[PDB]
Ligand binder design. Structure first.
Ligand SMILES: [Cu+2]
Ligand SMILES: [Cu+2]
Ligand code: NA
Ligand code: NA
Lengths: 618, 617
């Protein structure tokens, strides 16, 4: 019975019961986060621990609590000073509170009346506050509000942003702290209803079906609920309400030895910073993972359109606000798909023609965070490659388009704007290349000058620089010199006496653009550099720290790195920053075609020859 | 009817007939290149063919244009190859290097020093380049590197013979030089990837994946090579030098057929080697320009190379004598599922919406000695156009020096793989809503915290129009998100903005060789990521018409010197992209596919998303 198994309904019911018998979960208390802790290093009988963040709707200070579900006990419980360590993640039940409060506020009603907007039709997005110049918000749980008109129940409100207007609200005290009206902007009038035949036109009748089937079923097996074996790979698929799908114990069976590669892979944070300097939006930075918890909003994915082919679904269970278990039905898709040619050669001299097909194992989920929808895909390939891809879609976040244009906003439709922004991800890769004794080298291509030893000026080379200590392990991209990062095990040698390794291949997209002195540069410090390496510690889980909401800065990676620990042949963690810089285009409106970003790792002397010689002819 | 139709066997046979009739194709003559020309701008029909004719008795070659429609020779000119370059390598010349070397006393002595049976020594016929050997100028030379084949079915690449190279004049049939710098062990392990001893028991764990289309494919093929698919329109051409060429890429937006790209091809591909040993320091293979990648296109087997419901084209090429030869099932065409197109679950409206993506795939796979490359063009529902190269085959080997190397990787005991690049040039003759186009370079612009940007969150972008060819040689800047936008300044979308497409490059390293090198001059195109020229009908390749043993002086740097107006003109984008390959143990004994490419996405071309009319699955 695997200690990395998914949380069961019964387990969550029991932490609820333990928090009840123990005295911490009455009415007025509400769970802002609940998840299982990974087993400790070396222990592996089992002790299933859950960690819980408890909010206080009666305004008392929140608690961080660790419970043992195996022994039926509270391991620890500590009161939180939110002004110091940060506010708890946004609750789903607060998604409506911003709108409901504002609907009876005279300053808000006056702003709506000036624009002739019916209050019954004004939707207000519950938007994270960050930390700016407002002293009264320190210690207070604040959400900011931007308004969108919905003309009728099925209307897309994103088509009708109300610019020049923003409200700040305290969601514990149920007070409106501020209403800011800098002037009326026309509310864009065209609708963005992408299911309306008026807008779609007649639907295409030209697409013939593509049937993908597996008459003998899939080549992977699922045992113990979430243990996958596929084509030499083995792993455990976890799920957490903050991170979403998490991969554990990624290993590869090389002959008869199960060889670890990655101990834990996750998307540990993702931030969406906006680059419109208008006071109406200039505070806007959404930490979809750390503030909102992307796992909790995972869609129930339907067969034949979200996931095509022979699909095996996991239905993860999470906690509601009161500690009752809630299933995300068909929340995780697992399937294998063809991936074209793996290897091919037609040899003149031998007469031998050889072709083999590639395939990949896909483990995915899709989440919706307000207007955004994101797919998170992990891929394992026959040849040992590991890949992540994020697919970004949904509806773009809108504003008015100013008369006489903008350097910081795109026009989508008449009067309709889309502020510039980025989506930046952090992949946390707890590495275990042939076990835990690992190190990282930065590899650059090296150009050589024509001269003695290189008389024709054709020579080129490479250089590798070991990252020895955390203070040296904050690295940037250099696409021009083909910069990559190799994680090796200096005590595990391949048959050519070279240390075994994996090479991280980044897309080299721009990192965080904000000025280095900005609030967002301090709070999302991770996003300013492409690659970070830390020494593993059990309490260093997120690059932005445990409590991101209204936390002032420096938390997470920059504080971790400051310990300056030895990472040369030690248990280490790689943190890869990657993202999309989005200047919205007309083609993104009224619903955005998928765009993608990601990274991959390829074996680099890990194997003793190609690991796919034993793949059969098709 | 279509003037863009593939060459037929009859047309090639007629070109043969016209040339013979004109006295240009006697018994000593060989066709080193034959291809149909594209119709003239603003063109009833005149199918013209261009031919490079080699003479095996040593007479000067000719470049000839024929009108097959009119039965006439348009032009015929004698080439001085010392000046303008040698013709492409002929397939019949491949065996010549081995055959001549087998009775050469210097070569036999070198093999005897190594205890190698000449009957087992394969010799790779390698392009010579231009270096320090004055006697080679005006002569057709190939260089030879040796590999031992232990038995008929053995992979010779496992057993390179280092420290030895030979140079051969393939017309006079003379060995000009044999250089033996010293014996290296010939690596002993076999690289036989079908041998059960090396593969182990084959996996029985792979269960079938079946891709079918019960009602057939969603695309139509008319006039032999005209494809219509999900609003897209194009013609699929094929040339022996370039391989698959895409013509007239257009998109039917409502009632209007809107051009996007007039011609898309891979116009050159070079493989420069980075091992400074005299035995390999001359190695640079222009697979397209010197070898002609289309002529070596594989016949693709149903169910193995192309999975699903496949429509094949079987293009016809000329042999050395002007007789037509079909490449059976040489071009694959199919549509495939491409995951999610668009998705949103809206809380306020209660509407949940999901649509699937698809792409049209047009591909071919060629084999150039040890290398095998797949060339893939993709068209997506949303207007995206993409190219992908898939590189596989067996790596080019050497000895691995005792005490290591800064320029060669170890694959197996004693077996090396010198470092190299594979660098492609995509020639995109742009027609964004027609021919009046321009190109802007777009960079992200960071902004300083201060007045107007008090919280320091603002960021922007800037576009710089490339106005004349002298300003149109550009480099990558990944850090600033650099892209290039091709727009039509006379065609505006409903928001009064010029329609455009944005080119997204991979930002891989460009040519690494010292800028004073022969390869940096011969492959000048490869030193920069982006070039823009004014269209001219004789500016077809970034390296010129004749690359074999040709120095600098032709191709893109000569074209760019004309400094022509490209601001609202008929322009051509040339994008350099490549893989830099430090071979790894996992590449041996047969290489897993690696990829490189680029794409173009609509950028205000459409008045809103072009896939609102895609139905639910
Ligand atoms: Cu975006
Ligand atoms: Cu290569
Ligand atoms: Na680790
Ligand atoms: Na053009």
């Amino acid at each position: 019975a695997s200690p990395f198994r998914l949380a069961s309904a019964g387990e969550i019911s029991e932490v609820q019961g333990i928090l009840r018998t123990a005295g911490l979960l009455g009415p007025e208390k509400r769970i802002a986060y609940l998840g299982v802790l990974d087993p400790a290093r070396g222990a592996g009988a089992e002790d299933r621990r859950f960690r819980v963040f408890i909010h206080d709707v009666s305004g008392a200070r929140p608690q961080e609590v660790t419970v043992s579900v195996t022994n039926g006990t509270v391991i620890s419980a500590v009161e939180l000073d939110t002004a110091a360590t940060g506010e708890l993640p946004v609750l789903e039940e607060e998604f409506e509170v911003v709108e409901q409060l504002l609907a009876t506020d005279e300053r808000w009603l006056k702003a709506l009346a000036a624009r002739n907007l019916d209050v019954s039709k004004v939707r207000v997005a519950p938007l994270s506050a960050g930390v700016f110049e407002y002293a009264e918000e320190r210690g207070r749980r604040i959400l900011r509000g931007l308004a969108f008109v919905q003309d009728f129940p099925e209307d897309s409100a994103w088509a009708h942003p109300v610019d020049g207007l923003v409200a700040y609200v305290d969601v514990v005290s149920k007070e409106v702290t501020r209403v800011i009206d800098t002037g009326v902007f026309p509310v864009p009038a065209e609708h963005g209803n992408y299911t309306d035949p008026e807008l779609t036109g007649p639907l295409r009748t030209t697409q013939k079906p593509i049937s993908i089937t597996q008459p003998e079923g899939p080549s992977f097996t699922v045992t113990g609920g979430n243990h996958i074996e596929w084509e030499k790979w083995s792993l455990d698929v976890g799920f957490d309400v903050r991170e979403g799908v998490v991969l554990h114990n990624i290993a590869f069976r090389d002959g008869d030895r199960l060889r670890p590669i990655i101990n834990r892979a996750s998307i540990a944070e993702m931030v969406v910073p906006y680059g419109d300097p208008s006071p109406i939006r200039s505070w806007q930075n959404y930490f979809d993972t750390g503030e909102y918890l992307v796992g909790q909003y995972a869609n129930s994915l339907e067969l034949g359109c979200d996931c095509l082919g022979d699909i095996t679904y996991l239905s993860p269970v999470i906690s509601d606000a009161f500690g009752n278990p809630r299933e995300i039905r068909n929340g995780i898709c697992m399937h294998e798909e063809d991936w074209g040619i793996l290897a091919k050669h037609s040899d003149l001299w031998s007469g031998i023609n050889y072709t083999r097909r590639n395939r990949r194992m896909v483990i995915s989920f899709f989440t919706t965070i307000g207007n955004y929808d994101y797919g998170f895909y992990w891929y394992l390939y026959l040849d040992g490659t590991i890949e992540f891809e994020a697919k970004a879609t949904g509806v773009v976040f809108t504003s008015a388009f100013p008369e006489g244009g903008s350097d910081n906003i795109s026009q989508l439709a008449p009067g309709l704007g889309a502020p510039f922004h980025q989506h930046i991800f952090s992949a946390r890769l707890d590495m275990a290349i042939d076990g835990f004794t690992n190190r990282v080298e930065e590899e650059d291509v090296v150009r050589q000058t024509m001269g003695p030893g290189n008389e024709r000026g054709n020579a080129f080379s490479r250089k590798r620089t070991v990252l020895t200590r955390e203070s040296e392990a904050v690295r940037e991209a250099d696409a021009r010199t083909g910069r990559t990062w190799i994680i090796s095990n200096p005590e595990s040698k391949n048959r050519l006496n070279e240390p075994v390794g994996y090479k991280l291949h980044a897309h080299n997209q721009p990192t965080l653009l904000a000025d280095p002195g900005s609030s967002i540069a301090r709070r999302a410090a991770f996003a300013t550099k492409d690659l970070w390496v830390t020494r593993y510690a059990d309490d260093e889980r997120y690059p932005t720290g445990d409590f991101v909401n209204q936390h002032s800065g420096g938390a997470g990676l920059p504080s971790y790195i400051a310990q300056d620990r030895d990472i040369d042949g030690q248990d280490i963690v790689v943190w890869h920053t990657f993202g999309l810089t989005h200047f919205p285009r007309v083609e993104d409106w009224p619903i955005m075609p998928v765009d993608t970003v990601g990274f991959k790792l390829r074996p680099e002397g890990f194997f003793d020859r190609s690991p796919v010689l034993d793949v059969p002819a098709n």
